[PDB]
Design a protein around this ligand. Sequence first.
Ligand SMILES: [Zn+2]
Lengths: 378, 150, 121, 90, 286, 242, 204
Amino acid sequence: PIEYLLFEEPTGYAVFKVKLQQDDIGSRLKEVQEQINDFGAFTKLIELVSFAPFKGAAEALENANDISEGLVSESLKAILDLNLPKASSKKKNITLAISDKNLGPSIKEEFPYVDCISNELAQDLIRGVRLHGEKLFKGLQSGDLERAQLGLGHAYSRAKVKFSVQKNDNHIIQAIALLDQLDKDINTFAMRVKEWYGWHFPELAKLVPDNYTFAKLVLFIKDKASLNDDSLHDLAAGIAQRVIDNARISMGQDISETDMENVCVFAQRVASLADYRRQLYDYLCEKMHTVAPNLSELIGEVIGARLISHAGSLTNLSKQAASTVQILGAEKKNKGRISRYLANKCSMASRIDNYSEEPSNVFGSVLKKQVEQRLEFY
Amino acid sequence: LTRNIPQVSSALFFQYNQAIKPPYQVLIDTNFINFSIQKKVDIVRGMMDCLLAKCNPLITDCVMAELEKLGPKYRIALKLARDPRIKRLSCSHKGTYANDCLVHRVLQHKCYIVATNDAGLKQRIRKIPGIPLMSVGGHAYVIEKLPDVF
Amino acid sequence: NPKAFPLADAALTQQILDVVQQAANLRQLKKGANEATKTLNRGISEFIIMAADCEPIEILLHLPLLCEDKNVPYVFVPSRVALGRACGVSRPVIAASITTNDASAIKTQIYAVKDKIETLL
Amino acid sequence: DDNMRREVQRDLLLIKHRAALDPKRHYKKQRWEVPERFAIGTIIEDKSEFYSSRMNRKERKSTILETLMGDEASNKYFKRKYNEIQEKST
Amino acid sequence: TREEFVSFKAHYGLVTGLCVTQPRFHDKKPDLKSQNFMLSCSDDKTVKLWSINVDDYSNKNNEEGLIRTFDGESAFQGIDSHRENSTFATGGAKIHLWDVNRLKPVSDLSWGADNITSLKFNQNETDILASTGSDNSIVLYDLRTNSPTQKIVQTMRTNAICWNPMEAFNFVTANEDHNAYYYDMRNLSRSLNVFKDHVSAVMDVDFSPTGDEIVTGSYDKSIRIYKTNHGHSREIYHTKRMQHVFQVKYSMDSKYIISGSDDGNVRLWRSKAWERSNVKTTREKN
Amino acid sequence: GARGGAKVVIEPHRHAGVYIARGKEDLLVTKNMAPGESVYGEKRISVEEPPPTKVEYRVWNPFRSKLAAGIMGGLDELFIAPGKKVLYLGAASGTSVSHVSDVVGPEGVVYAVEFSHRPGRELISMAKKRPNIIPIIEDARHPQKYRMLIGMVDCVFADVAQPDQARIIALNSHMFLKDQGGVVISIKANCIDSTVDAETVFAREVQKLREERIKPLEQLTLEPYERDHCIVVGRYMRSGLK
Amino acid sequence: ARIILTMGIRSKASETDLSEILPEEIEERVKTAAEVSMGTEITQTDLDNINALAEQIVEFAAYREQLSNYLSARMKAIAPNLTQLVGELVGARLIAHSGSLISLAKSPASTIQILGAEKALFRALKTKHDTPKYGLLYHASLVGQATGKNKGKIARVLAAKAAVSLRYDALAEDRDDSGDIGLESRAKVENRLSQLEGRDLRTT
RNA sequence: GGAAACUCAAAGAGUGCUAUCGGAGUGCGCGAGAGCAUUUCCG
RNA sequence: GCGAUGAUCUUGACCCAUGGGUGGGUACAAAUGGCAGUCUGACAAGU
RNA sequence: GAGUCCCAUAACCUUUGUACCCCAGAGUGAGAAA
Ligand SMILES: [Zn+2]
């Protein structure tokens, strides 16, 4: 009496009619419990008769949570109301081979005419359908099981932990590891703008040494033909007169054109990169103020991002001890005991703003006042 | 190429075997039950009188198969060895041979003491190091290499 | 559901901190949060105690993630000044640890305390 | 590669005769046939470690042969042991 | 899983006979899809009825053992439960008929003051039953008339009787002369078969629920399987480690006979000693 | 010794997936799945391959991981092959599951279960990096409430710290482990029974396994790395136990 | 970069996607992946910051396309015989490896052949092996057309004609930059290649 | 001596592959047939 | 009007009255600096 | 005739610049001040 089976799967619910029966008395024998392993005899024993996939991802998570606490839900109750026949009271009531005794009473409460069962026969029949997996379903689906169960597992784990997805330190990690490399890339490509515009105007590297305003005035003057407009160079940059008369006295000059046009394209794009740096630094300034405010107020924003980058993650920094927050360069006798004090106060602030749910600034401020009193001790 | 030399099991000394704490686990076997009966000593009270400590006896499925296999002369032995005071192991190997079942069982654990009486099993047990055998003798038991008999 | 969940009541508090004072007189105790986490990620720690009223609670709440990962019991105690008086030191210590040592004469009381607090958690 | 580049012909002989490289080590006996699939790596230190397992940049040589030549105590032991061996052979 | 649900120190002396029941109380619903009821009579004058917690189903979530204890004047020698309406009969000094709503016996049904070794109800036309007493005698009884109805006397004492679950008026009879007789009820002058292959006392018999095979188990250390329509042994099981098989029963699957020796074990056997139990492909079954 | 910058050869080992890193002093090393980031602070070998690519390797610190000590003491065969699916009862944090993950590789999966919460959020924050693992934050004593999301693993491994070790692994292996599949458990003697000593509690646990139909085949003690644990390797027979 | 510029967050991915990118069979995969995804959510601050990152990284790719097209046009301007024979993305590596155009023209056909793989050359010379034969000319369009050791023979003859064309259009000071002896040498290399691949060393 | 396997033969292992009178009516069974069977519309 | 929320600390060696130089490390960047030198050279294919 | 196939589109070393630093180290762990 096992004639219907219910299997739950991370794409949908399945219900199997049990065609013939398993040998109950000899159900520990080798020649019976190898039939569950091989496939040519399991489909003699179990056929698919219904498979309704929940299609919403959040509805899959909700079905998984209701099964994991052992409670019926809409899709499960729907397919059992569809598939399970009303066994009339003259014959019997229908039986259903479900996987767990925690689920059992909650379907017996809702359907009276069903009767759940999980002995070792239902256990190893569900084990057999779990082992054979996709090859039972004979193509009534769109999507394999393992990627769907990967997503459903990660979602079920985060819904159990109720993990705060606003405590985001990986953003600050990638922000500072992009910021320093992007400063290096702006400097290298601006050296290429200098070395490429030297052939057209080599007395500009002496006058205008700043990379960004060099690139912007290279975007301004195309060829050496300006000679008059003095009232735009203090805007784009006194030295206006030096670059204007050096635009006719110098003449270390190649007169080339298409390369000057691509120099112009390169220079305006390097200026765009400088604008991107000048906004991303401010972005991680305020994101350092949001994520890690006590350590931000104590040590500074970019020094804090460098320190969390050296640690690897904020949680790893916090579970580091307070003497292994030795990092070279950052936290710049009487020159060393102040750095040790600042080190373990930085570890204290790291503990506060990581293990809080969402942190404040008052402890960063009183930490700043404590370390400033320790500095004025000198 | 995987060689396999078993390490000397790290709850053993040179030959002191500090893993045998006084609540003992003994391994009863077949002719030891038979000689216990035909010397008319008891089992649990006899072991307590020989060792001055609480002993938990064990019989394996191989030894129970031997005791069933030896026919109806030792129905007294089988009724005695189905005692609810003893426990029971569960072997998994081919061939119900009490000798190599016992000596394998004890040389991969070094914590059981072996309550035997036949010559070949006593020879193999006292050949391998640092497990104590006991045996019937006179009207009591006798221990061979326990470090604190008294 | 607060952030200092295994908070010990009164009688268990008194027995764990007289075990603390016996350990401090037997030279088997580490006093303070960062030496506690140093001996914790070194591994020698029978169990660790925190104080549930330090003015930032997170400066010792960083110890759960180490200790229940490295499988060692941990207990909150409702008074840092009582734990300081227990450790036998002037300033209030907020996070103590008991090192592991099988050559110390309080092994029985340490194991009784550890069994009681594993049943508590 | 089949020509073996001679550097991973040097240092494989080095780690095969590793047992006589410093007279305070005493590696356990093993034959060590050369593997026919093997690479050459470089230990990236931990960023949270310094002063105890970090080699200086002027000392990270291209192979462990030049790394073993780079210090002083190994050279002292090698010169005195090798000279005593030549004197014992003569 | 070949394991035990619960154990009970059920009595003091020898246990004599047990059977299971789905005992319909009148002040209680039959909760027989979550716990299962067995009752057992011994020779220390007690007949105990017990519940058993059983995970055959998983409907619910505790009343483990000793639901009640009927106690009798004389000793008790065997029982069997009438499978309808929660009635059960015992044997002892004389046969008694109880139901589970009374501590006292409802009826007393002997011929004379002679003890009764074993009983058995039917499997259909349930209101009649048979028994065997140590006057070497087979008695029948009918609860519809509430009286004994006929009595034959053989040449040796009948140990165990067993009805047929497909004929409803044939039974087998296992006695100490080494042959299991097979009687027709409504003409008890001729044992219409005699299965005649043992060497010692025929300690128990049972019909398979397919209705044509007989399992028997002898006082000598062997069991035999017969067919009904032949009268000699189909085949024989034995092992070195069983002595004096005292109780054999077919299972309801009609393929597995449960034998129980005197050594202590309850062994199992395939009836067909070569048909395996896996579901086979259709060319293999052909 | 073994400072940051030395050149170490990377020889393969018997257990496919792991590698021996032979320098002037030897290491045990697994090939890293997500390159560029250590997970619990271990040192990383970094080899170059020829379009120049660069792949990295992690060391396996046996004093802080369980089965690394069994590997270095020398087990006859594990079941953690480079293709299998591996269940991990008592996944504490990334500190061993990352090693079992990158032993398993990009095809097989590692289902890592965990009962506590704060190691759970650490496990999830590690688990977003490499994709071949599934973090589950459920109790290992109830394999019927994460039966929804896993299926038919090919070897289980066990580090849980409860005195119903055998019942945990027996229920999880009946519910999930396939037939003829491996089960590698790691018993801690002082954890599961403090009264009687190590060999007695190991023999009692391995007897509970061979009652729960796992046929054991290897017992290792891992003494120079941890004290009085043991690795017990077994197969799950279910058919022809003897 | 274009799909992060189009989606932004993964929640907007179901109701839209372009079909100019990810042609017709990766679209439903990325939509179902954004449905069942395992990463977390980010807000609009870091969303528009990585959006500006995607802007800069798509501008880098369009600028690399424009600059390689520029390199083709400019090499066709300066040394049209060499890039009419060999190819621009090989002549550029040749010139920028050897330094000046004149100090590449002052070099024989053998080193114009083996100008790339000099480290395998010198280790093969200082041990006892056999020196290589393609080097940097292997990525040209004609030694890939040849098959077998015919690419070795064609690498030598194309290095010789590269020397001819290269030092002509590096040393002449009156050329019209039409590539005349360039495509003449291309025709000679091509029918040399054809009449050497047309042999069949299998005895028919 | 190296072997092209594309000449064919005998065999050995590993892998994948399937099931067990016709619609109503009419005496009929607890909104209801899974069947007993026809001179009723019949076909 | 100190300190476990962490006190204390096991000094890179020379020229002058605790303060004035060579040597080191840690990061990038450049080099027409080095390692570092650009293969063979008259036959081959087809009948 | 003749190794593109371990990035000479490079690696390493040295020098030169630039910015920082010149404390034990899986730091120790209970005293300083008068
Ligand atoms: Zn055995």
